[PDB]
């Protein structure tokens with residue numbers, strides 16, 4: 375089953391401090407949630423610059439941003455608290471319809487406006503609650519790759535989803551990289567063509583080729599999230615959330631599994647277009663391939679430390 379395949383390579387130590395820290399953050403008072411992330415954002419910006427949101431994304435968030443910018447200060451603060459509290463409001467429903475990148479670009483803009491004083495800032499001299507100060511301390515002790523994953527997950531969690539098949543807004547799909555200019559990965563130990571083609575197609579934004587590597591019932595499990603099952607949902611996820619990554623796999627190991635299956639573990643690094651080469655996340659991929667080589671299951675794990683990379 376997909377759910378049992380979740381257990382392959384049980385030695386892999388994932389960075390479960392990330393969902394732990396998100397769960398602590400999610401307990402906090404909404405104003406402290408907003409202050410804490412402001413605090414973390416300012417500090418992090420001393421050494422790491424976030425890439426600008428794409429034009430399409432900004433256009434899609436523009437109405438909502440304008441609405442907030444038109445509010446009085448107290449209402450601005452209430453609107454941001456509504457998003458953090460996951461209140462059911464029109465703003466919260468609009469926000470929930472957005473892909474992660476659009477939500478991130480919305481908050482990018484608000485951060486700039488708060489820095490400039492045009493959107494109500496965190497109150498001057500604000501002191502975090504006892505629980506919130508310790509949450510921030512944990513965040514600031516993590517590796518940058520973990521730090522940025524905590525911030526993304528806090529952003530994505532905000533807002534209010536009412537319904538099963540509500541509208542989904544995402545950025546337009548980029549055209550795949552021309553075949554001529556495509557790079558090929560090299561992985562120590564691993565010549566498996568399905569793994570190599572996985573990595574190379576994702577790096578080229580070639581989602582239609584990538585999806586064809588999977589079994590019809592196959593699943594992909596992103597870090598700290600449940601498996602996404604079947605070709606339509608996995609392709610959806612590629613198109614909405616997996617554009618412009620850079621996968622830098624380094625080494626792997628290849629083992630038999632029950633029934634002519636093969637299990638392969640690869641470790642390496644990943645860069646998100648929000649940070650480019652300044653943040654390299656430590657990642658493992660865990661593949662379960664059927665006898666024909668298609669992908670029945672792949673898990674992508676954020677690793678606890680670089681000491682989890684194979685043969686560090």
Ligand SMILES: CC1=C(/C=C/C(C)=C/C=C/C(C)=C/C=C/C=C(C)/C=C/C=C(C)/C=C/C2=C(C)C(=O)CCC2(C)C)C(C)(C)CCC1=O
Nearest residue numbers: 408411412415481482484485522523525526596646648674
């Ligand atoms: C919120 C907020 C603010 C602002 C906050 C702001 C502006 C925060 C901005 C935060 C940003 C821009 C975070 C970006 C994170 C991106 C990550 C972790 C991507 C990981 C990708 C991975 C691992 C993908 C890997 C993958 C591989 C390898 C596969 O093989 C398959 C695909 C898959 C995707 C799984 C303010 C500052 C205004 C204060 C108030 C406040 O609350």
Ligand SMILES: [Cl-]
Nearest residue numbers: 615646647648
């Ligand atoms: Cl990303």
